[PDB]
């Protein structure tokens, strides 16, 4: 019968229609033709929620548990080496590769890179 | 650049350079003024509740702590309450017609004036002190079958936009590279900005939207940035080119005073014919 | 190609040092005490709630990637040149970087102080939504070689599962690899 | 090539008597530039060098 | 801007056809041509020279 | 295919030793360094030219037309 | 260490074996094909070609006679009974002089197709057997298969093979056309009866209705045909079926199915979906404007059959069915030929059953509480065999023959012919105006490579799925048959991550060989210990011992959500547990089928348990012993044996790669050797671990571009073009694999002296340098 | 409509229904003799010396937070001996439930992983002797 | 821990269907049970009728092949309870309209 703002025939398993669909007093099975008394139920109520994810915000971030957010130092990218900057003459270079090497200066922030 | 002469880049970023009294907070500040802000970015959680002598539904809204957003996204409850006592719903029980259709003390006050010029709106409500929560309630005809009332809103608030900017989008502050001291933003609007003085000196800005630089500030200017964009090109590749073929090539494309790509557009004004032949 | 005894001596000490790296660069992110034990549930648990984002995901590896790039600028700076057994100009591996006649010192030195952590596209390796990188271990274990962070060099081999990553590595450059522009400027330009 | 992915290409078919000759006094079938290692980076062809000079003895 | 012919058999190459074909006549056979006194070989280095 | 004449490098005659080099491993059971030892081949040079030898003609020898099977 | 075993290669050599080849695992390298080629007449079933024509039935015209009250004419049944295929077999000219063993050395000396005759048991019968009539008509010479059961070489010893002329080890196990050497490579595919949660953009751009959300399953019919199911869900929380016939989709409500299937009532379709789930709204919410949409649209519908008699209505001409059938009878057609036909015809309420498992489960993929898979992850995949494949692309021509037979009658009546059913010359007066040939469109296939059918049987492309067989080298040969890939359909597709390496295919596909350039991540190779189901293995006793395991019957009990384990074998639903319940069992099948001691029991089979977790994959317990399951052996850690595994159930699966590597409480299992995970160009180079992959990548393509030694076969063999290594040595450095397959045979290069040097400056820019003397001397001979 | 080699089952034994008392579901493999027990525990059990387990399938067969969703419904003996009536108990007709079910299955104990047998030390690639 | 087995009804007494949650019949309802002997093995056919329903019920041949079913009464002011053997029939109910 009532599950969940939906009501079934206690005889078979069909949806009971909506009474205040229902234009008589009484509810009857269209199909095992057993009626019911309208006032036998009413005035259900149904509360619902949003998913979590539904709005995504910053203050998303701030309340998550975890570091999301990244600051100037941590972006140093990869090891250093000993690099001469053919600009400003600074001895550390930062690289990357692809062999296509990639050069950045340490104090000018200079770059180059170097396939050969 | 050359190929398109695109009207609208997927990226153009204007870059803002500040005074120097200016701190950083007052711009960080700053920055979320003219920042875009979105209703779905405040809102803590919805609860919705529906009942059916008609088929009604109760609707609560929760915001998270007012100082908050108010700090964070430089928010006032009052446009927070206008926003939504305006434009939220007008636009709410706009879509659900089209919805049914496709199926076949001064808070009372306040109250009273909505729910005059708003069918379905039998109540509302609102958190007038820590702004905490916004609730209300709608009715419909109680025959009405069932509507999904969460997605419809949810659509909703993402559309939201309770503080938005002429053409200006994002603005971001970026490290002071090279002892320059600058904003970096989407979207472009030189007037808008052009009250910002206070913040800004306005000679110093730049953008890739060259088009509106010619449209704003005419051909000289705009050929400027042409070559400075290009350069930052292989710039970032570190890749050195003589500034003479650049403004060969930039002085080329504004012979017409206009911004002109190379295609069969900037080739079709040739008065040369075989050229234009043998192309396409 | 072989050190002084000494340089592998040294080559070992700092390498030594690395073992909880992974797990320090953890706590942090999840905002855990650095002390906390690899075992803490929470920990795994954010580590899940982390997997599932993309994001963070990503804002972990450079976290990690940064701290470990450290150490690998330790390794390389100590052993070469100083401990090599042929010194320039006899050794010519060198003497050919060195001279600039070909490669760089990045080539000697992942061939002798180790190859450090891969990189994927900014990444590190993807992971099995099981949560494991590898069927070798675990989900969620904290290590950077878990990871990816390389301790071989071509010289003394390297694992199967250390093997196995390089060979994505290698595949990148490959698909990479894998005009019409000037065409137009030289046309219209004549 | 060899089995270590070295793809090279004939040049000069070198008369013998110029051949270089070892202690041994032999001469050397197929010389190799080591330029070409520092940057394929291929170790193990050094290493099966060892061994076939090895295992041969 | 001709009927099509029996549904199928392929359209027979008309003069408009013939000007753009490839790159077009003038790209195919003008802006490059094949040409005499010319050769095509493999190289390989000497210092000597 | 089959025994080749000379060793590549040293010219020396490396053909004959063949079937008496079969023989040592076969009677004598020997080593390969002994065996060779034995041959006298001093220089790898020659060993390599023996040791890693194959009758791979053999094979062939099994297909004759000139012949009914 | 190693031996170079000269005196044993030598007799070897000298004295071909006359029982057995010493090299098993070469033979086993190609056995899928011969596996996938033998079953097609094997097995129990009588072959699946027996089976696959027997699901394609009967074809029936009427006459349409007077007869002298409605009558629409005499029932004319034609019905093929059974396939048979003679060994290739040759008469001397006309006259049926006695035909004679016809060794493919010959049919390549001819340029020809290596054929033996097609023959069929074609039952022609009359007014529901009123009159039946039989004969058998020759197909005609049919491609096939070296080392098959048709072909007479079977089982023949290396010393026999000689007498037949052809290569010692030979391992055939391909086609031969216009005495040109084809095979058919292998594709990759989804799973058989598996239902994954997809998201994909083309979803919507189906229509508005849709999201990018979505359900499929590939089913797959006993003979091996498959047929694959599709669900979308509306943006307005709608789901509608769809499938596609013909090349053709269609689309339906669900619950039109859902009744149809068994006679039904709503609480029966509720509390299948939630069961005990009831207190979330957003199910219910859903679940009830699913069933009052299906009110009102269709309100005079109550009845399973008055849904039935309305289906057929609309469909019938779509099938065709032929007008005597009632609507009825073409609606019992439809669920028969369409819905999770796998599962038979009469497994209407497992189907039920099963079809409502992937409604709850498509929600939670939409409620997002459960992660989507990934299609293109190695995790869900298998290999399309071609051998399979060959039967189906006869069983479409089959069935296209068998309908012109009807044409022409049609035609013949049409023309309002003089007919009578039962004269079987009239019978044979069809056909003599009928082309029967289906091995000249077969070799036409096999020539073409050309997949031309009215069913596209879920495939991505018209051709190339043929390959030329390459004896260039000897390694060229052997590669192509561990090589498969994803279909060309793919290759035009610009994303890149379809060619990323994935953790997943350890153990599987070589991560080191593959193609560089275009093709590349797309062909793959496996790693040379793999394996391949070519079989059904038997689940009968499972269902047994699941009940005796406490297992719930799935029929009486009603449960959904992940919120405990499902079971399921093979796209059928056992029951329900609990996870903590589950995976303990799982353990001791695991434990069991190492075991090996319970009957019922197959140890290729695949126990799929995954464990409930937090939004990752959807938890359940999975068994597999279908066809096409990669399958590789891993070393136990107790009753220390073998043990087979799939690379899906693999995922989760603690797995110690070396003994020393092993901590208590971790692993479950450890690999045999670290090289099984490799392949064979990949265990061939030296060393190659102390060389930087690319390289090795880019070896393993020189390999197959050497000047080899292609075969011994020269003296007879007609191939078109070859290169002949004058002289090979024996690499001295080399590892155990080689002999394991013994390239001595085979080899493709010689050993030298070498020195590392800076001499002529000649050198520079990688050219190589040449003692012009050894050249003189022979060195480096070719023809 | 009776299939074949059906009979009317004509004489029903009694049935005694009604801290009250409980009315009970159990499952015993097919094999077991139930007609000669005497224990039963509310875990591990033996039958016949041979040994199984209880479990407590309860909330499979209905839900143990909430009453009505019972899966099955009990049929008793009629006042006539010659058919079935559902069983109630609740002066209301309200169909019984079952308080309880359980299934007696069999277990198949598990012995430890013998670590001495199994983790071995790695050994060196061997040295060839005689060099 | 321990409970005693007062007695064990080896004939049919009892029967138990599955129809669904919930699920009950009018007052007046009764049903007629079916029985035959195949193999060692016990089948149930199970027939209800009332004035506009119909119940049909039969016993799972797969299950019966591994499953014996048993209804206990159980008296807990006492160690002791009641065993009778009962089948398990799989039900449904049809509406005569
Ligand atoms: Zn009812
Ligand atoms: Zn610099
Ligand atoms: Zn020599």
Redesign the pocket.
Same mark, same amino acid.
């Given at each position: 019968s009532v599950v969940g703002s939906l009501i079934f025939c206690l005889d078979c398993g069909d949806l009971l229609e909506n009474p205040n669909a229902v234009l008589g007093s009484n509810v009857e099975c269209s199909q095992c033709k057993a009626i019911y008394p309208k006032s036998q139920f009413s005035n259900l109520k149904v509360v619902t929620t949003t998913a979590d994810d539904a709005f995504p915000s910053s203050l998303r971030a701030k309340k998550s548990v975890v570091k999301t957010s990244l600051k100037k130092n941590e972006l140093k990218d990869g090891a250093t080496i000993k690099?001469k *900057?053919?600009? *400003?003459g600074?001895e550390e270079?930062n690289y990357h590769t692809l062999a296509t090497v990639f050069? &950045? *200066? &340490?104090? *000018?922030?200079?770059?180059?890179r170097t396939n050969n | 650049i050359v190929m398109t002469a695109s009207a609208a880049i997927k990226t153009p970023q204007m870059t803002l350079p500040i005074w120097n009294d200016v701190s950083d907070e007052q711009a960080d500040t700053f920055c979320k003024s003219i920042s875009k802000v979105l209703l779905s970015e405040v809102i803590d959680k919805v609860i919705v509740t529906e009942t059916t002598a008609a088929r009604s539904y109760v609707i609560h809204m929760r915001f998270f702590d007012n100082n908050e957003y108010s700090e964070e996204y430089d928010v006032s409850k009052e446009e927070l309450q206008n926003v939504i006592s305006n434009q939220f719903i007008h636009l709410l029980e706009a879509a659900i017609v089209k919805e049914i259709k496709k199926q076949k003390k001064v808070q009372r006050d306040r109250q009273s004036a909505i729910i005059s010029h708003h069918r379905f709106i039998t109540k509302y409500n609102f958190d007038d002190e820590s702004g905490k929560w916004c609730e209300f309630k709608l009715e419909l005809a109680a025959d009405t079958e069932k509507l999904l009332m969460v997605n419809i809103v949810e659509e909703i608030c993402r559309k939201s936009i309770i503080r938005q900017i002429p053409h200006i989008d994002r603005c971001v502050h970026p490290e002071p590279e090279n002892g320059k001291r600058v904003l970096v933003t989407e979207g472009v609007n030189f007037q808008a900005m052009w009250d910002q003085e206070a913040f800004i000196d306005v000679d110093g800005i730049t953008s890739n939207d060259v088009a509106a630089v010619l449209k704003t500030y005419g051909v000289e200017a705009a050929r400027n940035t042409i070559v400075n964009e290009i350069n930052n090109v292989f710039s970032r590749y570190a890749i050195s080119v003589s500034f003479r073929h650049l403004d060969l090539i930039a002085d080329m494309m504004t012979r017409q005073g206009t911004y002109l790509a190379f295609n069969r557009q900037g080739m079709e004004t040739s008065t040369s014919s075989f050229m234009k032949m043998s192309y396409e | 190609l072989r050190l002084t005894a000494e340089g592998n001596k040294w080559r070992t000490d700092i390498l030594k040092t690395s073992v909880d790296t992974g797990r320090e660069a953890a706590a942090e992110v999840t905002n855990l005490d650095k002390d906390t034990p690899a075992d803490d549930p929470e920990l795994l648990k954010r580590l899940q709630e982390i997997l599932r984002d993309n994001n963070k995901s990503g804002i972990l590896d450079a976290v990690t990637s940064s701290k470990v790039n450290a150490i690998t600028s330790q390794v390389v700076s100590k052993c070469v040149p100083d401990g090599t057994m042929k010194k320039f100009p006899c050794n010519s591996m060198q003497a050919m970087a060195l001279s600039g006649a070909k490669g760089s010192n990045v080539n000697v030195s992942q061939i002798m102080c180790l190859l450090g952590q891969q990189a994927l596209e900014g990444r590190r390796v993807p992971v099995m939504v099981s949560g494991k990188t590898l069927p070798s271990f675990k989900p969620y274990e904290t290590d950077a070689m878990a990871g990816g962070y390389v301790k071989g060099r071509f010289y003394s081999g390297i694992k199967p599962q250390e093997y196995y990553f390089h060979c994505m590595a290698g595949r990148e450059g490959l698909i990479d690899t894998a005009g019409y522009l000037q065409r137009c400027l030289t046309k219209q330009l004549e | 090539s060899s089995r270590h992915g070295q793809k090279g290409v004939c040049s000069r078919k070198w008369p013998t008597i110029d051949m270089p000759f070892s202690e041994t006094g032999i001469q050397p079938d197929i010389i190799i530039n080591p330029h070409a290692f520092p940057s394929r980076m291929t170790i193990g062809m050094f290493v099966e060098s060892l061994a076939g000079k090895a295992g041969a003895l | 801007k001709a009927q099509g012919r029996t549904s199928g058999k392929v359209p027979i190459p008309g003069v408009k056809q013939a000007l753009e074909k490839k790159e077009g006549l003038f790209r195919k056979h003008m802006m490059g041509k094949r040409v005499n006194y010319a050769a095509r070989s493999v190289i390989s280095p000497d210092p000597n020279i | 295919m089959i025994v080749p004449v000379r060793c590549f490098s040293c010219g020396k005659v490396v053909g004959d030793k063949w079937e008496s080099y079969l023989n040592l491993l076969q009677e004598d059971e020997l080593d390969e360094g002994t065996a060779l030892s034995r041959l006298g081949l001093k220089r790898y040079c020659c060993r390599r030219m023996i040791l890693t030898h194959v009758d791979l003609i053999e094979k062939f020898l099994r297909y004759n037309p000139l012949e009914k099977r | 260490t190693a031996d170079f075993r000269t005196l044993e290669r030598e007799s070897r050599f000298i004295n071909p074996p006359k029982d057995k080849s010493a090299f098993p695992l070469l033979q086993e390298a190609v056995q899928p094909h011969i596996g996938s080629f033998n079953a097609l007449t094997e097995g129990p079933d009588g072959g699946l070609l027996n089976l696959g024509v027997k699901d394609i039935g009967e074809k029936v015209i009427f006459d349409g006679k007077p007869l002298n009250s409605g009558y629409l004419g005499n029932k004319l049944s034609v019905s093929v009974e059974q396939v048979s295929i003679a060994k290739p077999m040759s008469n001397d000219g006309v006259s049926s002089a006695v035909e004679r063993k016809v060794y493919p050395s010959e049919s390549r000396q001819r340029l020809t197709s290596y054929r033996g005759k097609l023959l069929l048991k074609l039952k022609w019968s009359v007014n529901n057997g009123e009159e039946n009539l039989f004969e058998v008509r020759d197909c005609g010479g049919l491609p096939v298969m070296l080392q098959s059961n048709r072909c007479h070489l079977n089982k023949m010893s290396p010393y026999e093979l000689v007498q037949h002329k052809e290569e010692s080890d030979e391992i055939g196990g391909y086609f031969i056309v216009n005495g040109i050497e084809k095979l058919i490579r292998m594709l990759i595919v989804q799973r058989r009866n598996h239902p994954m949660a997809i998201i994909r953009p083309s979803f919507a751009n189906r229509g508005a209705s849709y999201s990018h959300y979505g359900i499929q399953i590939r089913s797959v019919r006993p003979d091996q045909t498959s047929q694959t199911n599709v669900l979308h869900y509306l943006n307005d929380g709608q789901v509608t079926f769809r499938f596609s016939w013909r090349k053709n989709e269609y689309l339906v409500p669900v619950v039109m199915i859902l009744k149809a299937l068994c006679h039904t009532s709503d609480r029966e379709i509720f509390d299948g979906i939630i069961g005990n789930d009831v207190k979330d709204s957003f199910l219910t919410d859903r679940l009830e404007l699913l069933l009052r949409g299906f009110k009102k649209r269709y309100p005079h519908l109550q009845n399973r059959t008055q849904v039935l008699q309305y289906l057929g209505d609309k469909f019938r001409v779509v099938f065709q069915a032929s007008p005597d059938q009632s609507d009825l009878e073409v609606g019992q057609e439809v669920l028969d030929r369409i819905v999770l036909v796998h599962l038979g015809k009469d497994g209407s309420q497992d189907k039920f059953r099963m079809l409502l498992f992937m409604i709850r489960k498509l929600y939670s993929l939409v409620a997002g509480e459960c992660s989507p898979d990934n299609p293109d992850a190695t995790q869900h995949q298998e290999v399309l065999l071609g051998g399979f494949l060959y039967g189906m692309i006869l069983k479409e021509k089959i069935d296209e023959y068998l309908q012109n037979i009807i044409a022409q009658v049609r035609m013949d009546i049409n023309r309002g012919m003089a007919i009578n059913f039962k004269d079987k010359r009239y019978m044979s007066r069809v056909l003599m105006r009928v082309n029967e040939n289906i091995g000249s469109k077969m070799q036409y296939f096999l020539s073409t490579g050309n997949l031309v059918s009215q069913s596209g049987l879920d495939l991505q492309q018209v051709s190339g799925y043929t390959v030329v067989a390459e004896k260039i080298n000897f390694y060229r040969f052997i590669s192509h048959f561990r090589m498969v890939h994803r279909g060309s359909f793919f290759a035009q597709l610009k994303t890149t991550t379809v060619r990323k390496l994935l953790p997943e295919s350890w153990g599987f596909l070589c991560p080191v060989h593959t193609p560089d350039g275009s093709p590349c991540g797309l062909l793959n190779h496996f790693a040379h210990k793999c394996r391949i189901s070519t079989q059904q293995s038997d689940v009968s006793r499972i269902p047994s011992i699941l009940y005796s395991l406490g297992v719930a019957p799935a029929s009486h009990t009603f449960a959904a959500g992940p919120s405990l384990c499902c079971v399921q074998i093979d796209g059928k639903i056992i029951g329900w547990v609990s996870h903590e319940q589950g995976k303990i069992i799982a353990d001791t099948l695991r434990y069991w089928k190492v075991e090996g001691k319970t009957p019922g029991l197959p140890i290729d089979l695949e126990i799929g348990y995954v464990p409930p977790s937090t939004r990752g994959q959807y938890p359940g317990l999975y068994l597999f012993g279908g066809h096409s399951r990669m399958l590789r052996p891993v070393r136990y850690l107790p009753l220390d044996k073998e043990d087979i595994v799939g690379p899906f159930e693999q995922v989760y699966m603690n797995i110690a790669v070396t003994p020393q590597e092993i901590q208590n409480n971790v692993h479950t299992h450890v690999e045999f050797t670290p090289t099984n995970i490799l392949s064979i160009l990949a265990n061939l180079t030296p060393f190659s671990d102390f060389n930087q992959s690319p390289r090795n990548m880019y070896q393993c393509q020189m390999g197959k571009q050497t000047m080899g030694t292609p075969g011994v076969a020269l003296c007879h063999r007609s191939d078109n073009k070859l290169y002949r290594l004058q002289t090979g040595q024996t690499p001295i450095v080399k590892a155990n694999l080689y002999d394991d397959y013994g390239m001595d045979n085979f080899p493709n290069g010689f050993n030298a002296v070498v020195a590392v040097i800076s001499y002529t400056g000649y050198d520079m820019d990688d050219a190589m340098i040449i003692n012009k003397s050894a050249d003189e001397r022979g060195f480096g001979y070719g023809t | 409509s009776i299939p074949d080699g059906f009979k009317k089952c004509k004489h029903l034994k009694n049935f005694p229904l009604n801290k009250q008392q409980q009315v009970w579901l159990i499952k015993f493999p097919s094999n077991v003799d139930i007609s000669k027990l005497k224990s039963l525990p509310v875990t591990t059990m033996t039958i016949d010396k041979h040994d199984y387990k209880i479990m407590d399938d309860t909330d499979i067969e209905s839900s143990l937070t909430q009453d009505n969703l019972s899966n099955m419904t009990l049929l008793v003996p009629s006042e006539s001996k010659e058919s079935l009536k559902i069983a109630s108990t609740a002066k209301d007709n309200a169909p019984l439930q079952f308080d309880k079910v359980f299934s007696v299955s069999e277990t198949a104990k598990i012995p430890a992983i013998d670590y001495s047998k199994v983790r071995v030390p790695r050994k060196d690639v061997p040295k060839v002797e005689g060099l | 821990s321990e409970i005693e087995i007062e007695s064990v009804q080896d004939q049919p007494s009892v029967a138990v269907g599955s129809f669904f949650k919930g699920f009950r019949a009018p007052s007046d309802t009764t049903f007629d049970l079916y029985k035959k002997k195949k193999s060692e093995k016990d089948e149930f056919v199970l027939h209800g009728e009332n004035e506009r329903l119909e119940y049909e019920g039969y016993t799972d041949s797969s299950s019966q092949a591994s499953n014996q079913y048993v209804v206990g009464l159980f008296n807990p002011e006492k160690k002791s309870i009641q065993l009778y053997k009962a089948p398990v029939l799989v039900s449904k109910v049809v509406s005569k309209s």
């Open positions: 690099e *900057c053919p600009q *400003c600074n270079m050069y &950045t *200066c &340490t104090s *000018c922030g200079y770059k180059f | - | - | - | - | - | - | - | -």
